[PDB]
């Protein structure tokens, strides 16, 4: 983990994510009145680009706390922009860092795949408890989870591939389709893949909301985060499972979304495949509940417990891990 | 290989699958009425190509659980009379006769990574008749110095941050070069002809009919090379790729960046830093493909090179 964020690739991926980086830039600059002349704490600053956005927004003092080796690159970026007097890159975890003062605001890019995989939300909440002033600002302030049933067209392509071999090469391989379905759908993994609007089978349902200012959100991460949903299918298509994505809200309201209906990001969406495709029709009712949990082996690994019911079928469950 | 994705990836590789189909079908005269051994048949698609080419019998040996799907595929094509799927490794399988030909899809990344060449050589010694047909029959290894254009854009990205967000990050290019080039790992990436700095050089050839080739793989495979640069560009390292040659009745399946792309792409051997070169800059050296000391299935590459008047350097790559 320390080895990943000390490398260039993940930071190159995060900054080249134009939708994400421009959203944080605007969400910060939009809060100029709340940041002008104030102090900011950046949890997991990486290269320090968000700390510099806060200084450009008028912040008097920004502390860029970064645990991996990339803090030495953040120091170089900050001096390269002539900002080391206002932006102080501090190495180490935010839980053991020593600030000279409680800060007026906390900014952090903490979200992982499925919102909570390999996430540093607990590190941000730990910094909110220890260093945020009473009534301080949080950027982003909240995260919203969404779910929708899907008919993954790419999966349908990989499933029908074996029925298409004979047209191209003359060898009938349609008997592979039953075997390919079990291999691509029978597993219990969370699949990270980006879908389009054509894949969405019903109206996306918002099933959970996390307000980062709430005390006790820390304990609820251990118990599990999620909620219940109900939707009606747009039309007839094979139900492959569900897509789970998130958005974060900045106090303005600016929204950074990872929805398939909105421009793509590096998070894509988290796909929960059923064991087999399920035929559904227009106005088919799909209800259930989804819980985002830490894996019992690794508290940084996202586990998702799915409970669902399709029409008159009996309620089923499935247990996913990243 | 009991999972579908690797077989789906192999068959979706149109350049690879069509080359094997033609190397088999164009050998109809040599395969008509003859027997074929398919080493690692997987789904059995190559064994059915050999049947259409005219083979009187094909033994499709497969060691993973995918042999049950190949058993179904052969039945679905009405060919279980002359195509027989036999489970287990080719080293312990019992055939009723020696065969006239061997067909096998055995090449891995860098030709010899997660390859089954030894199993094919084991089957050549045990089951192939004298002078029998091998499909493919040989493999040719190539090297060319490269200026990776994708690597240069990944390096130049940090100087472009100030234009969009107003934060200068050009100090990262020095740090990104060490991280993307200072490692000692074989990078599997596909290049184009624009990346090639000099005329590709063949530095080794493997003849699959040769007994004792298996012992030579364990000592190392490769040879020397010499090339002069096309023009001026930063030298980032060397790309290694292969081609397999079928006996004609001569079709070649290439993984060169100058030829249509395959799933093997090319094996990129990056230097620690970029090296400026110009037109007619002579690059000489030697490359050896070896089994890793930790894992004999894992490809290691010893690179020894000299750029112009610079001192001869070496670098030790693994997959
Ligand atoms: N946004 C994400 N999904 N991940 C961002 C992780 C970034 O925050 C850094 N980071 C993670 N946890 C911490 C922590 N407790 N304290 C400081 N930096 C941290 C990590 O080094 C990397 O730069
Ligand atoms: N990896 C490749 N270059 N080709 C695919 C390997 C295929 O050959 C099969 N295979 C590999 N080694 C052997 C062996 N010794 N005997 C039989 N089948 C084998 C493997 O199960 C898979 O279906």
UniProtKB/Swiss-Prot annotation, chain A:
UniProt cross-references to SUPFAM superfamilies, sorted A to Z: S-adenosyl-L-methionine-dependent methyltransferases
Reaction(s) catalysed by this chain's protein: L-arginyl-[protein] + 2 S-adenosyl-L-methionine = N(omega),N(omega)-dimethyl-L-arginyl-[protein] + 2 S-adenosyl-L-homocysteine + 2 H(+)
The UniProt record lists the keyword Cell cycle: no
One annotated Gene Ontology cellular component of this protein: nucleolus
Pfam families per UniProt: Methyltransf_25, PRMT_C
Keywords noted in UniProt: Chromatin regulator, DNA damage, DNA repair, Methylation, Methyltransferase, Nucleus, Repressor, S-adenosyl-L-methionine, Transcription, Transcription regulation, Transferase
Active-site residues, record numbering mapped to chain: 109, 118
Biological processes annotated in GO: cellular senescence; DNA repair; methylation; negative regulation of DNA-templated transcription; negative regulation of transcription by RNA polymerase II; negative regulation of ubiquitin-dependent protein catabolic process; protein modification process; regulation of mitochondrion organization
KO phenotype (gene knockout): Embryonic fibroblasts from mutant mice display growth defects, premature senescence and increased levels of TP53 and multiple TP53 targets. In liver, knockdown disrupts the formation of a cAMP-mediated transcription complex involving CRTC2, reduces the expression of genes encoding gluconeogenic factors and decreases glucose output in primary hepatocytes, it also restores euglycemia in insulin-resistant mice.
A GO molecular-function descriptor: protein-arginine omega-N monomethyltransferase activity
Domain SAM-dependent MTase PRMT-type: 1-322
Top enzyme category: transferase
Keyword DNA damage found: yes
Signal peptide: none
PTM remark: Automethylation enhances its stability.
Location within or outside the cell: Nucleus
Lineage top rank: taxon: Eukaryota
Primary localization: nucleus
InterPro entries on file: Arg_MeTrfase, Methyltransf_25, PRMT_dom, SAM-dependent_MTases_sf
Family listed: Belongs to the class I-like SAM-binding methyltransferase superfamily. Protein arginine N-methyltransferase family. PRMT6 subfamily.
PANTHER family assigned: PROTEIN ARGININE N-METHYLTRANSFERASE, PROTEIN ARGININE N-METHYLTRANSFERASE 6
Subunit structure and binding partners: Interacts with (and methylates) HIV-1 Tat, Rev and Nucleocapsid protein p7 (NC). Interacts with EPB41L3 and NCOA1.
Protein name: Protein arginine N-methyltransferase 6
């Amino acid at each position: 983990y320390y080895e990943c964020y000390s490398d260039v690739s993940v930071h190159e991926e995060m900054i080249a994510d134009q939708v994400r980086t421009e959203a944080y830039r605007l969400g910060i600059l939009k809060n100029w009145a709340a940041l002008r002349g104030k102090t900011v704490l950046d949890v997991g600053a990486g290269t320090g680009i968000l700390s510099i956005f806060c200084a450009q927004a008028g912040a008097r003092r920004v502390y860029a706390v970064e645990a991996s080796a990339i803090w030495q690159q953040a120091r170089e970026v900050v001096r390269l922009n002539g900002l080391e007097d206002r932006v102080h890159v501090l190495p180490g975890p935010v839980e053991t860092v020593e600030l000279p003062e409680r800060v007026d605001a906390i900014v952090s890019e903490w979200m992982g795949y499925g919102l909570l995989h390999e996430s540093m939300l607990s590190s941000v909440l730990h910094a909110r408890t220890k260093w945020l002033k009473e009534g301080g600002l949080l950027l982003p302030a909240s995260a919203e989870l969404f779910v929708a049933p899907i008919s993954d067209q790419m999966l349908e392509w990989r499933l029908g591939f074996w029925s298409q071999v004979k047209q191209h090469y003359g060898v009938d391989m349609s008997c592979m389709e039953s075997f390919a379905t079990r291999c691509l759908m029978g597993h219990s993994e969370i699949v990270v893949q980006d879908l389009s609007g054509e894949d969405v089978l019903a109206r996306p349902q918002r099933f959970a909301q996390l307000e980062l200012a709430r005390a006790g959100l820390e304990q609820e991460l251990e118990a599990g985060v999620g909620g219940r949903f109900r939707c009606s299918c747009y039309g007839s298509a094979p139900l492959h499972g569900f897509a789970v994505w998130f958005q974060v809200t900045f106090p303005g309201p600016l929204v950074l979304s990872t929805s398939p209906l909105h421009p793509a990001t590096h998070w894509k969406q988290a796909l929960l495949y059923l064991n087999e495709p399920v035929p559904v029709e227009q106005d088919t009712d799909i209800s259930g509940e989804i819980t985002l949990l830490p894996s019992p082996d690794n508290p940084r690994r996202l586990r998702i417990l799915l409970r669902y019911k399709v029409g008159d079928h009996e309620e089923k469950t499935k247990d996913f891990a990243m």
